[PDB]
Amino acid sequence: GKTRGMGAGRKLKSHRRRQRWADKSYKKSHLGNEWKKPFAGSSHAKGIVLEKIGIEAKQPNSAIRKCARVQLIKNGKKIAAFVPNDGCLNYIEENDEVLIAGFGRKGHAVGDIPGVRFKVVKVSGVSLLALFKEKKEKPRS
Amino acid sequence: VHVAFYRNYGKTFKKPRRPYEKERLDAELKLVGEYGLRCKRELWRVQYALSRIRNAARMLLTLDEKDPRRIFEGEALLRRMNRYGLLDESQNKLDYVLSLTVENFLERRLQTLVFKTGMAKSIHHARVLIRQRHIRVGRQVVNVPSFMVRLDSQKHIDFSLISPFGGGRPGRVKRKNQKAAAK
Amino acid sequence: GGKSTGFGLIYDSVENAKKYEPKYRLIRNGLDTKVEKSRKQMKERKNRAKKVRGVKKTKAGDA
Amino acid sequence: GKVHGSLARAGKVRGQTPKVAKQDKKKKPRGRAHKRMQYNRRFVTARGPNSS
RNA sequence: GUAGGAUAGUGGCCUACCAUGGUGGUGACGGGUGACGGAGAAUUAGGGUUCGAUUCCGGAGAGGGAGCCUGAGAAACGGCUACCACAUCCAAGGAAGGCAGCAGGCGCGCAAAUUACCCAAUCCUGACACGGGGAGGUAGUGACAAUAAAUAACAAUACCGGCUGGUAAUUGGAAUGAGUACAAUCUAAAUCCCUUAACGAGGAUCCAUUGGAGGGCAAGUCUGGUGCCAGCAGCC
Numbered sequence A: 001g002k003t004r005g006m007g008a009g010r011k012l013k014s015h016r017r018r019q020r021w022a023d024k025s026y027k028k029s030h031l032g033n034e035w036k037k038p039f040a041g042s043s044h045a046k047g048i049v050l051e052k053i054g055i056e057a058k059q060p061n062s063a064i065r066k067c068a069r070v071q072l073i074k075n076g077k078k079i080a081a082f083v084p085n086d087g088c089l090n091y092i093e094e095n096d097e098v099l100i101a102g103f104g105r106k107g108h109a110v111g112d113i114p115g116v117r118f119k120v121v122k123v124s125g126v127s128l129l130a131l132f133k134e135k136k137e138k139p140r141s
Numbered sequence B: 001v002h003v004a005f006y007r008n009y010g011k012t013f014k015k016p017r018r019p020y021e022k023e024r025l026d027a028e029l030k031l032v033g034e035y036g037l038r039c040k041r042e043l044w045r046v047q048y049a050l051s052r053i054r055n056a057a058r059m060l061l062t063l064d065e066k067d068p069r070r071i072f073e074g075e076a077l078l079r080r081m082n083r084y085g086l087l088d089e090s091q092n093k094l095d096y097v098l099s100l101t102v103e104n105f106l107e108r109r110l111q112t113l114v115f116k117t118g119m120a121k122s123i124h125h126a127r128v129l130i131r132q133r134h135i136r137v138g139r140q141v142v143n144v145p146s147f148m149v150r151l152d153s154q155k156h157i158d159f160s161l162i163s164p165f166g167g168g169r170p171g172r173v174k175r176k177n178q179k180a181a182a183k
Numbered sequence C: 001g002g003k004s005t006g007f008g009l010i011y012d013s014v015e016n017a018k019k020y021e022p023k024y025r026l027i028r029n030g031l032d033t034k035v036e037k038s039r040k041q042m043k044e045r046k047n048r049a050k051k052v053r054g055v056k057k058t059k060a061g062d063a
Numbered sequence D: 001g002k003v004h005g006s007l008a009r010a011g012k013v014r015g016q017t018p019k020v021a022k023q024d025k026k027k028k029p030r031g032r033a034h035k036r037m038q039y040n041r042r043f044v045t046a047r048g049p050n051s052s
Numbered sequence E: 001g002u003a004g005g006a007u008a009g010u011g012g013c014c015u016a017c018c019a020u021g022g023u024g025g026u027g028a029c030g031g032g033u034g035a036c037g038g039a040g041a042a043u044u045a046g047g048g049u050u051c052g053a054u055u056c057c058g059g060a061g062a063g064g065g066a067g068c069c070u071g072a073g074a075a076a077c078g079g080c081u082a083c084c085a086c087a088u089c090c091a092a093g094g095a096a097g098g099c100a101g102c103a104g105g106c107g108c109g110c111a112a113a114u115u116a117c118c119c120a121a122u123c124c125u126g127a128c129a130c131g132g133g134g135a136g137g138u139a140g141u142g143a144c145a146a147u148a149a150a151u152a153a154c155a156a157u158a159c160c161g162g163c164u165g166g167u168a169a170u171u172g173g174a175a176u177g178a179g180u181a182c183a184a185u186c187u188a189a190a191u192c193c194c195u196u197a198a199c200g201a202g203g204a205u206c207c208a209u210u211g212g213a214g215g216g217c218a219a220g221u222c223u224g225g226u227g228c229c230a231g232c233a234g235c236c
């Protein structure tokens, strides 16, 4: 059973402090490992496109999910980023400048795409959404 | 230091906890259409004010009847509700504050009053008249439909003295038509 | 509309006004003339004159 | 033994989709008038609102 | 602990001699902090959780250290001296440096504005009622955040539903601010706001968008295309 002594406040505080580490959410935000991850605790990161890659969809689906290999400028790390929307991979080229955001699940894969935790938001300073709707045009240079 | 930084501001409404309650949506649309509101934000702002007042009254009712703080704040709140027409003289207890509904506050809007006294053919007509500077409360022109009319000021509502419906100088359309007809 | 509010001062005589009123208010009434000057130019002239000693300091600030 | 999926297929359906022009329709009222229309449609005049 | 030195002054602050003491699972000592502390901020049954660089208070720093003069007050940096790192000019002999002040530039990055006007207000300062003040204020950029609030209102006609309501790029005249502009007002001077001559609305082109329509969760078993492809899908 719990300790209940009126003079046992120290033990209760220490026990809670020790047991907090069993909590995964608490440990994630108190171990200081977010700075060694590709984004280093940022909502977005810019990078250079290295190569277009197709990723097979997970069972029971069957598709080729279009993604890009991006090297982050600020630390040189390499990640896989999904390119959403139909035919939007055609707006991406090798050595292009892309803005990368999270996939929405805080560092975890989404949907039937395996091992992909990022998506492309902008290419060459123009949002992919504008390119898909023809609102803007990708800069020639 | 920038002295402007010391000015304070606050929010006036909150979004619903559950966005897509069908019954809540139906009731809110009914109220908005009845009172001719432009969006749900106005209704939520009125609900926020009503909730604040009801919370204050409920907090006061928890204190002892002879508590000086309860006496002072209850008198202040009852006077405030009486000034704006929310409560009648017979409704002289903090308990009746808890029985206040959003409709009570909505009925005190300058738009609703302008519609009710007969200066407008409809609630929307009252809205457009108010926002077009055709209405004055006392000697002051008011163009804010959300204006809450006090009991004393209710009987002073009238057409603006500088408006076609309150004085002379018809509108630009009428003047243009008169000029055109002069030939 | 149709109403306005403000502040007014009536001095016993013009000399008292000239002695107590701000310069800009006197200018507004025509009792004083606005002198055209640039604060940045004054600062630059002062800084330039800082480096010159003696009577020549007077024309040093011109540059 | 097929051509299931590849990078060269990007934009297939969107390119295939025939282009249909948008019909020119009168603008709906905004704000209070829009709310008035909604209230009249759902309460005064009157299955789902988009039933066939 | 004793006696001295130094200090504005107490004190191992320092010196000489003497004693073996001092802290520690009631966590010392050591390490980390993407740690300046507080007043406070977010959320609120209660208890709690998370945040606090930033305008108020206290501390520290002026590229990194160290030393110091003047002075009531500084170990000052829009003061000096030396070293270290950067770094401008040179007639090559020398000579001058410190934006974590206001602007502004490079760099960095997801990430942040004008090299403007003024001491008119608040206050500070000097020999001084008067000078000065990038403190501070004004104006510029500004969908951080917050407040109010347009994009239509009313009749006739025709359709519909029970005199009463709803619809119509059908008709009819009324109203008005977005804009524009004399003028005045505002203002240190301007500008904006407020006020207001003359203009300013019918597809009132003065044309509202962002997301969605299997469920969670409000909204189509509509039509065409594609055919585990392309794609969607926070989860199913």
Ligand SMILES: [K+]
Binding pocket: A056, A057, A058, A059, A060, A061, A062, A063
């Ligand atoms: K598969």
Ligand SMILES: [K+]
Binding pocket: A060, A061, A062, E228
């Ligand atoms: K499937």
Ligand SMILES: [K+]
Binding pocket: E007, E009, E010
């Ligand atoms: K001492």
Ligand SMILES: [K+]
Binding pocket: none
């Ligand atoms: K001693």
Ligand SMILES: [K+]
Binding pocket: E036, E037, E059
């Ligand atoms: K500190």
Ligand SMILES: [K+]
Binding pocket: E071
């Ligand atoms: K002195």
Ligand SMILES: [K+]
Binding pocket: E099
């Ligand atoms: K600067």
Ligand SMILES: [K+]
Binding pocket: E119
């Ligand atoms: K001043």
Ligand SMILES: [K+]
Binding pocket: E217
């Ligand atoms: K859904």
Ligand SMILES: [Mg+2]
Binding pocket: none
């Ligand atoms: Mg001593």
Ligand SMILES: [Mg+2]
Binding pocket: none
């Ligand atoms: Mg702090």
Ligand SMILES: [Mg+2]
Binding pocket: none
């Ligand atoms: Mg820091």
Ligand SMILES: [Mg+2]
Binding pocket: E054
């Ligand atoms: Mg700052």
Ligand SMILES: [Mg+2]
Binding pocket: none
């Ligand atoms: Mg401070």
Ligand SMILES: [Mg+2]
Binding pocket: none
């Ligand atoms: Mg210092």
Ligand SMILES: [Mg+2]
Binding pocket: E063
């Ligand atoms: Mg520096």
